[PDB]
Design a binder for this molecule. Structure first.
Ligand SMILES: CC(C)CCn1nc(-c2cccs2)c(O)c(C2=Nc3ccc(NS(C)(=O)=O)cc3S(=O)(=O)C2)c1=O
Length: 557
């Protein structure tokens, strides 16, 4: 069937859109080439519509149904609970889009009677009606990149009340079931370092290792009614409250399977028969579906000891090599299977034999050295997009502070330490806004984070090593430095110089500022300080940062 049918009505915005990098007095200090940097808008929504709209066909064999039976058996060991309206309301982002029924996210958060009462009506409706399609808004995402122009991605989401209801029915399922079903293959269970460890450990268990990333062209659009019903049969495997079963069944039929699409103007834009990107089950659905199709495809392609690491639609396999051109033969059969399963590639998958050159989740393992000289593996990425977005955030205040999220996730990296930390802490200093908590997203979930906690956060996630990394890899150094020349970013010599200022200004304030100055910037000096554990690190509750993924899932921790 066709992933989308369109009526001709446009995908429209709520307000005016900037595609051109906003410029303030702080811009040139970071990036000179403003022409590179752009944001996607509703303007290109037609281009995307062209791309995401295709016919799907599926060829399900025994490998598929065999993998499915295993997955279901594991799933049948999960007991999951209903969240109450109260609990579900507290998982709603303060800034989450308001309801069509006369209330917003903050009404839902402090549990106002208008909000709670409607949500009950929605729930009652879900239990009693299992046929009537649920309305969705379709929108074009505004996202910031560097010239490589990508069209805007699309986002499809149900009304606020339905979203609270999703949490009640499924939050606990989508949080706990993926790890039970897929074990070590589930990626959102890992911090950046734990992901690096699982990869390296897994790479090191192959006699002759081969790995590849599989890029599915428009994953959401490949996902069929079958897949979406297949994944519900997995959900229903759990021990569930009877109202959870009904609600999960109703939500699958009325929402997840598909339904009518409506623009911000209230115009009928058509109909979706594929995965919605703005529902609770998106990340978990994509994860289960990708792991199902991919595990089966390795039985097809007859891959030797195939190990997977799945995060939604992002797939990486590591297996035994059958020789360089037998692998090339192996992957084409894999792709053939994946393609039969309704999941063809965007780019053909190339086999790698250098772990440090496998790109999965936009990232790759690299290597550097700690204080002792000891080789330490860490996760890194191409800083192009991070710095393009940091440029936008230099001039605009936005819902998601990508720089803060990037510093957290990529603290051990050259570019994050030298540029991201140096630029943004300087800005917080200048405004004396070091103490203001900032929203940022990790695995799709929203978090309020105070920048002064960064040292404590970084020690816990990465270890004291991250404050001491040096002698980075030559290909890593080359990539950063080349990205810099491309974006017109100052050379790392200037950043080293700026950082000495920032450190000094931070040390002078004392308190947590000195702590930030001490650990985050010890790299800046030649006469270096000896770094010891911080007391506060034990007191932070990070248990929940890397359990599950919730892209488009309206989650706030
Ligand atoms: C271990 C990690 C460092 C690897 C890179 N990384 N980084 C982040 C960051 C959060 C904040 C700054 S970077 C991050 O939020 C993600 C995420 N990756 C994917 C990938 C693939 C998907 N696929 S989907 C849309 O669910 O079908 C979803 C996500 S996410 O949950 O939105 C977050 C990520 O993969």
């Amino acid at each position: 069937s066709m992933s989308y049918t369109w009526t001709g009505a446009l995908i429209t915005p709520c307000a005016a859109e900037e595609s051109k990098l906003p410029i303030n007095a702080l811009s040139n200090s970071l990036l000179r080439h403003h022409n590179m940097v752009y944001a996607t808008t509703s303007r290109s929504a037609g281009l995307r519509q062209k791309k995401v709209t295709f016919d799907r066909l599926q060829v399900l064999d025994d490998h598929y149904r065999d993998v499915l039976k295993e997955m279901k058996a594991k799933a049948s060991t999960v007991k999951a609970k209903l969240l109450s309206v109260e609990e579900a309301c507290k998982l709603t982002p303060p800034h989450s889009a308001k309801s069509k029924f006369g209330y917003g996210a903050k009404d839902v958060r402090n549990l106002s009677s208008k909000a709670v009462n409607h949500i009950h009506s929605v729930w009652k409706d879900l239990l009693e009606d299992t046929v009537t399609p649920i309305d969705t808004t379709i929108m074009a995402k505004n996202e910031v990149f560097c010239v490589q122009r990508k069209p805007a991605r699309l986002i499809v989401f149900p009304d606020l009340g339905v979203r609270v209801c999703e949490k009640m029915a499924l939050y606990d399922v989508v949080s706990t079931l993926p790890q039970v079903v897929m074990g070590s293959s589930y990626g959102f269970q890992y911090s950046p370092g734990q992901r690096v460890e699982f990869l390296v450990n897994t790479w090191k268990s192959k006699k002759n290792p081969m790995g590849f990333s599989y890029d599915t062209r428009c994953f959401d659009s490949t996902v069929t009614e079958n897949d979406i019903r297949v994944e519900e049969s997995i959900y229903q495997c759990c021990d569930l409250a009877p109202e959870a079963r009904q609600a999960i069944k109703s939500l699958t039929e009325r929402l997840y399977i598909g339904g009518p699409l409506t623009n911000s103007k209230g115009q009928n834009c058509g109909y979706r028969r594929c995965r919605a990107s703005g529902v609770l089950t998106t990340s978990c659905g994509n994860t289960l579906t990708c792991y199902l199709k991919a595990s089966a495809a390795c039985r097809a392609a007859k891959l030797q000891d195939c190990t997977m690491l799945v995060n939604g639609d992002d797939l990486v396999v590591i297996c035994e090599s059958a020789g360089t051109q037998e692998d090339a033969a192996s992957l084409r059969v894999f792709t053939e299977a994946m393609t039969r399963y309704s999941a063809p590639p965007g780019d053909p998958p190339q086999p790698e034999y250098d772990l440090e050159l496998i790109t999965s989740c936009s990232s790759n393992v690299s290597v550097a050295h700690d204080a002792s000289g000891k080789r330490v593996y860490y996760l890194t990425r191409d800083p192009t997009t991070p710095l393009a977005r940091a440029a936008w955030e230099t001039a605009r205040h936005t819902p998601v502070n990508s720089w803060l999220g990037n510093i957290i996730m990529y603290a051990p990296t050259l570019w994050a330490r030298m540029i991201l930390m140096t630029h943004f802490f300087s800005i917080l200093l200048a405004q004396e806004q070091l103490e203001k908590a900032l929203d940022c997203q990790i695995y799709g979930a929203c978090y309020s984070i105070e920048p002064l906690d960064l040292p404590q956060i970084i020690e816990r996630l990465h270890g004291l090593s991250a404050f001491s990394l040096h002698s980075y890899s030559p290909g890593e150094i080359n990539r950063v430095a080349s990205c810099l020349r491309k974006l017109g970013v100052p050379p790392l010599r200037v950043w080293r110089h700026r950082a000495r200022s920032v450190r000094a200004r931070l040390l002078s304030q004392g308190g947590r500022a000195a702590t930030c100055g001490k650990y985050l910037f010890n790299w800046a000096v030649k006469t270096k300080l000896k770094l010891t554990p911080i007391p506060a690190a034990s007191q932070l509750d990070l248990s929940g940062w890397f359990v599950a993924g919730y892209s488009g899932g309206d989650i706030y921790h």
